[PDB]
Write a protein that binds this ligand. Sequence first.
Ligand SMILES: CC(C)[C@H](NC(=O)COc1ccccc1)C(=O)N[C@@H](Cc1ccccc1)[C@@H](O)[C@H](N)[C@H](O)Cc1ccccc1
Lengths: 99, 99
Amino acid sequence: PQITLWKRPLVTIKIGGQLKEALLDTGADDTVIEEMSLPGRWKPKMIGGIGGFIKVRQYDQIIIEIAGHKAIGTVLVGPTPVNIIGRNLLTQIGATLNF
Amino acid sequence: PQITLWKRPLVTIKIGGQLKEALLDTGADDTVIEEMSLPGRWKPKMIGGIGGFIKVRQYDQIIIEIAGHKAIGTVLVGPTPVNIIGRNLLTQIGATLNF
Ligand SMILES: CC(C)[C@H](NC(=O)COc1ccccc1)C(=O)N[C@@H](Cc1ccccc1)[C@@H](O)[C@H](N)[C@H](O)Cc1ccccc1
């Protein structure tokens, strides 16, 4: 499937058995999900962009579904303004930016 | 042109007659460029990112070139750590997401 960028590129994802929405973000190195109860081992990390950095929980080898596609990798959990699917997982589902 | 996402999707832009690198950023509504002198009228604006808000100068109807494509539209100038090309201009260059 293919998406223009006339609207925010929101897709449904499944994480820890819960449905959420998230932005497919080519500008994001990493994947950042709002605070939630997520089983798994984690370690503290900072992640940043415009406006500075926030402290997040770094979970490795998390199974997540992104628009129907299964991916497994690192997910950062923290006080992000919006759920973000970054390049670490977009690459695993074979997403590309075309023009 | 099909950009895989193993590395940050950086391209060359031309703005105010100067070449710069910039990131193609499907998660950004707007296009934000680091501090530079640009001639003409602007208005003040605040935009938000992962770490909070920054103040920017909002310039409308700027002529810009992005990876060889012409565009004309709104450019925000302020203390972003990375020059970003948001959806307002990505739609002009015809960028789409594919997976
Ligand atoms: C998510 C982050 C892991 C990501 N940052 C990065 O991927 C790398 O961040 C840095 C920070 C400093 C220096 C060098 C690199 C990011 O901010 N990505 C942003 C672009 C960017 C900003 C600053 C530096 C590098 C990229 C955008 O893609 C951003 N995710 C969107 O605006 C999404 C969004 C929409 C609405 C509200 C809040 C967030």
